[PDB]
Amino acid sequence: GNIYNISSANELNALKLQPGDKVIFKKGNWKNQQINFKANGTKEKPVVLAAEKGGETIFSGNSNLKIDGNWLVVDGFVFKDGFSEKADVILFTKSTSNSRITNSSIINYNHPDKTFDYKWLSLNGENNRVDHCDFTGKTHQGTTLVVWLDEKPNHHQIDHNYFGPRPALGVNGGETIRIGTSTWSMHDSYTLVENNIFDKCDGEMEIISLKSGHNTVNNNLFYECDGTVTFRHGNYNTVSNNYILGNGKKNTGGIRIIGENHKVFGNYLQGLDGSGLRAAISIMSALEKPQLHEYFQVINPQIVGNIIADSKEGIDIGAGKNEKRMLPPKDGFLKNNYVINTRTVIKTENEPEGLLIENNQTDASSLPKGFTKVGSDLVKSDGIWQKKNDVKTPFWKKEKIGPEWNN
Amino acid sequence: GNIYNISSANELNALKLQPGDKVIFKKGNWKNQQINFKANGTKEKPVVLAAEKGGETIFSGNSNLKIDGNWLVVDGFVFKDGFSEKADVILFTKSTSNSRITNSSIINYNHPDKTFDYKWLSLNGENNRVDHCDFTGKTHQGTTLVVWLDEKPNHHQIDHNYFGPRPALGVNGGETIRIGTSTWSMHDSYTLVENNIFDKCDGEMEIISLKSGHNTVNNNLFYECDGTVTFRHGNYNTVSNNYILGNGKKNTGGIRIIGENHKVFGNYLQGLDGSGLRAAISIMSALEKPQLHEYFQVINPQIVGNIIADSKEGIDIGAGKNEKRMLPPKDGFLKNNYVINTRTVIKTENEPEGLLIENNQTDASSLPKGFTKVGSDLVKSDGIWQKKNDVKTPFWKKEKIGPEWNNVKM
Numbered sequence: 046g047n048i049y050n051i052s053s054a055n056e057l058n059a060l061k062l063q064p065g066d067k068v069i070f071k072k073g074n075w076k077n078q079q080i081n082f083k084a085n086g087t088k089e090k091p092v093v094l095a096a097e098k099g100g101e102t103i104f105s106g107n108s109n110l111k112i113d114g115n116w117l118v119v120d121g122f123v124f125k126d127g128f129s130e131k132a133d134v135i136l137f138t139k140s141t142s143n144s145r146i147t148n149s150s151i152i153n154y155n156h157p158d159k160t161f162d163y164k165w166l167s168l169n170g171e172n173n174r175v176d177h178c179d180f181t182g183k184t185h186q187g188t189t190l191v192v193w194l195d196e197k198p199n200h201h202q203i204d205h206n207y208f209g210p211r212p213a214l215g216v217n218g219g220e221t222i223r224i225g226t227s228t229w230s231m232h233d234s235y236t237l238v239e240n241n242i243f244d245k246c247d248g249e250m251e252i253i254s255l256k257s258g259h260n261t262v263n264n265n266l267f268y269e270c271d272g273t274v275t276f277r278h279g280n281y282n283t284v285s286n287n288y289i290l291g292n293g294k295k296n297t298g299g300i301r302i303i304g305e306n307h308k309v310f311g312n313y314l315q316g317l318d319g320s321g322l323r324a325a326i327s328i329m330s331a332l333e334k335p336q337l338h339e340y341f342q343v344i345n346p347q348i349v350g351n352i353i354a355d356s357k358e359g360i361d362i363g364a365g366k367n368e369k370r371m372l373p374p375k376d377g378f379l380k381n382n383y384v385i386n387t388r389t390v391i392k393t394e395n396e397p398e399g400l401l402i403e404n405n406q407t408d409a410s411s412l413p414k415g416f417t418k419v420g421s422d423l424v425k426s427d428g429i430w431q432k433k434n435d436v437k438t439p440f441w442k443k444e445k446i447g448p449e450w451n452n
Numbered sequence: 453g454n455i456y457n458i459s460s461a462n463e464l465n466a467l468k469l470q471p472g473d474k475v476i477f478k479k480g481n482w483k484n485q486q487i488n489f490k491a492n493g494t495k496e497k498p499v500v501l502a503a504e505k506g507g508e509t510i511f512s513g514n515s516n517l518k519i520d521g522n523w524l525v526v527d528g529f530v531f532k533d534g535f536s537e538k539a540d541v542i543l544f545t546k547s548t549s550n551s552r553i554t555n556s557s558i559i560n561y562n563h564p565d566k567t568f569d570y571k572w573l574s575l576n577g578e579n580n581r582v583d584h585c586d587f588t589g590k591t592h593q594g595t596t597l598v599v600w601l602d603e604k605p606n607h608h609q610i611d612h613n614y615f616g617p618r619p620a621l622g623v624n625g626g627e628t629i630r631i632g633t634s635t636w637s638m639h640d641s642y643t644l645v646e647n648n649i650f651d652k653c654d655g656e657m658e659i660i661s662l663k664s665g666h667n668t669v670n671n672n673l674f675y676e677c678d679g680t681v682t683f684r685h686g687n688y689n690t691v692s693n694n695y696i697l698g699n700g701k702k703n704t705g706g707i708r709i710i711g712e713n714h715k716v717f718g719n720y721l722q723g724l725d726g727s728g729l730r731a732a733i734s735i736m737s738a739l740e741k742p743q744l745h746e747y748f749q750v751i752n753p754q755i756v757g758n759i760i761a762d763s764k765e766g767i768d769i770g771a772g773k774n775e776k777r778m779l780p781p782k783d784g785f786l787k788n789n790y791v792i793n794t795r796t797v798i799k800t801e802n803e804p805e806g807l808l809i810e811n812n813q814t815d816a817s818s819l820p821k822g823f824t825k826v827g828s829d830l831v832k833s834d835g836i837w838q839k840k841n842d843v844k845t846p847f848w849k850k851e852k853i854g855p856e857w858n859n860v861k862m
């Protein structure tokens with residue numbers, strides 16, 4: 046197709062784009078750009094909106110980007126020195142399918158009013174991808190990246206991004222990633238959050254809030270995060286092969302489980318300071334007849350192959366128990382987990398019903414039922430305690446995370 | 453305020469409008485107009501986008517309107533001789549409040565593909581108004597006018613519009629008005645549909661589909677409509693003072709009740725050819741533990757003062773009963789209703805539980821339980837049987853329905 050070198054969102058609007066067209070935004074700092082990337086491409090010929098030189102096309106002031114259409118690719122942009130007046134910084138519309146944003150950044154794009162809500166990235170539509178991006182420094186109301194649910198699963202892919210430091214919001218709505226809302230929580234989303242770094246994401250209790258079904262949070266790093274990866278609403282979610290490395294940092298929590306048929310496996314939950322709701326593996330108590338926005342009993346959780354090391358509290362069965370939250374976790378199993386150099390191996394706030402605890406290993410002098418002394422050889426490679434027969438280089442050591450043009 | 457005189461959507465894009473401005477789109481037929489009416493007005497000084505003369509600014513080809521802002525008024529435009537390529541023809545964004553569309557039309561604006569889905573008017577946000585508009589001739593997939601539910605009630609108002617002929621679509625998605633989806637059915641909408649005419653809206657089973665709560669379908673005319681006003685999902689909805697005049701036309705139905713705490717009162721249900729689900733008042737059976745998209749047991753239905761005349765079937769109690777749908781209507785009352793010159797006055801498919809049926813007058817020789825012999829309380833005025841003391845001029849006989857610039861007649 047054609048290559049169009051532009052220096053304004055107006056020029057992009059006065060353009061008719063066909064598959065294979067590439068729009069190149071001139072390098073520089075462009076203020077108050079309302080970009081509407083509205084076009085349609087194909088798998089073999091997508092329409093591309095790329096920066097002249099990666100990381101050198103800045104959108105300052107009140108600049109926004111809307112991605113509207115099929116097979117669209119946005120590449121190399123940086124939103125800094127500004128804020129949005131009302132809309133989300135980056136938006137994929139409901140009719141936007143098979144589109145992607147890559148090598149892009151949103152840095153300190155904060156509203157002067159800390160209570161003024163907007164998200165930095167909103168995902169809608171189907172099979173859209175956010176990759177090799179950088180979202181750092183959100184100080185105002187609103188989750189950084191939202192996956193907005195619909196009647197059909199989205200199969201969105203959020204991968205290889207760097208979610209930088211997010212200061213404590215003080216109130217709810219400060220998550221890094223929220224997948225769904227309580228109304229859409231009984232719907233399947235099928236979102237994949239994979240190979241991302243969540244560095245110092247302290248916005249609120251939940252770094253990731255899963256509020257829909259069949260999502261997968263796989264092989265990510267949660268580095269020194271004041272929060273937890275929570276299974277808030279919904280069923281059939283998976284939290285696997287992740288590294289939650291709090292580095293002894295205050296209130297660094299693990300994985301919080303609420304709802305049914307969840308799989309928590311292969312995670313490294315090390316150097317965590319949290320307890321109760323922020324335990325390395327927190328299994329919550331729930332209400333009898335809950336509305337969507339409330340708490341659903343933990344039924345059939347499958348917690349296997351997790352290595353908890355150097356932490357305050359490893360497992361908390363029945364966390365959050367009170368007058369309304371009396372229902373204990375039921376069914377499922379807690380098998381083949383390791384709990385080393387952890388002050389509390391297992392806490393029980395509510396006796397579980399039929400939760401099978403067996404073949405777990407700990408270095409604790411006192412073995413709680415279902416735990417034995419450590420029999421497998423362990424190794425501390427790349428700062429992480431791993432099984433000597435399953436030692437691997439963590440993804441961030443051998444892959445580029447965040448923009449390609451950055452370091 | 454400022455008065456702008458444009459002839460293109462490109463001119464509108466370059467205009468920086470403030471509370472009190474009025475943009476006047478020049479008389480003519482303009483094709484492929486992508487109208488983005490983005491502005492913020494006030495209650496005292498609104499921002500109007502008006503046609504030079506109502507009905508004389510035509511948007512043909514692939515034209516679309518987006519109403520994105522506060523206190524905005526769109527007035528006098530016609531969408532015809534074209535179709536939407538992807539988007540709904542007229543849209544109120546989720547960021548829109550206190551905005552209005554009046555004296556406007558969408559006429560046979562059909563995509564060449566009958567299965568291609570887009571709505572003609574889409575409502576989002578809150579306190580928005582669609583009035584004095586003409587929506588006629590939808591042949592392709594999709595509900596004509598949609599109220600899209602959100603987390604807070606909308607309080608939208610749909611009034612004095614003319615919804616003209618809609619051919620049968622043959623599948624779901626052929627409603628005239630859908631207020632919500634089963635996902636949002638337990639949410640309050642607070643939408644009002646009042647003083648509109650639904651003329652020959654044969655799109656599908658439901659002329660109007662209520663899939664949310666606290667809605668009011670009041671004082672409308674459904675003339676020769678192949679379908680029903682269905683309380684599909686949601687509770688506390690009201691269907692009152694409507695004229696459902698089938699005029700003997702094949703499968704013309706009435707009001708279909710599903711769910712809880714609904715009110716059905718003062719309706720004239722006459723010349724209906726429908727039975728079972730399409731009876732004048734059809735009170736459905738339901739599943740024991742249903743999902744939000746299925747059928748919820750009819751609880752506390754309050755059916756009073758309905759004048760059912762010249763129909764195939766008056767009331768069907770337990771309509772749609774099957775092996776799954778066994779829960780019958782419970783509680784509430786069916787009282788002060790009139791059923792005259794009707795083949796089956798009241799049919800009972802599933803025996804109701806605790807349903808009060810008293811003071812219902814009819815002319816059928818064998819009086820059913822809770823029915824008394826009708827006297828001379830009713831009179832046939834304007835071709836509509838009415839209670840003598842309550843005789844009135846129908847709203848459509850004395851009000852402009854549809855655009856002010858159009859001399860419409862059924």
Ligand SMILES: O=C(O)C1=C[C@H](O)[C@H](O)[C@H](O[C@H]2[C@H](O)[C@H](O)[C@H](O[C@H]3[C@H](O)[C@H](O)[C@H](O[C@H]4[C@H](O)[C@H](O)[C@H](O)O[C@H]4C(=O)O)O[C@H]3C(=O)O)O[C@H]2C(=O)O)O1
Binds near residue numbers: 218
């Ligand atoms: O440990 C906890 O996290 C927790 C403990 C407390 O006891 C509370 O129960 C607390 O509840 C929160 C839950 O996440 C709950 O499902 C719900 O979420 C709301 C909340 O407003 C979110 O910020 C959010 O927002 C959406 C949503 O559509 C909302 O209705 C509104 O329109 O705004 C948007 C938006 O753009 O942000 O999601 C909501 C939702 O899922 O319904 O309430 C929370 C709360 O009350 O704090 O959990």
Ligand SMILES: O=C(O)C1=C[C@H](O)[C@H](O)[C@H](O[C@H]2[C@H](O)[C@H](O)[C@H](O[C@H]3[C@H](O)[C@H](O)[C@H](O)O[C@H]3C(=O)O)O[C@H]2C(=O)O)O1
Binds near residue numbers: 624684746
């Ligand atoms: O109207 C009926 O009598 C009816 C009978 C069928 O047996 C079935 O239960 C049917 O389901 C329809 C109903 O409107 C549901 O709420 C649902 O609706 C969705 C549908 O795709 C529709 O076009 C619109 O988009 O609303 C959707 C929603 O989820 O609300 O399905 C309908 C269907 O035909 O399956 O009602």
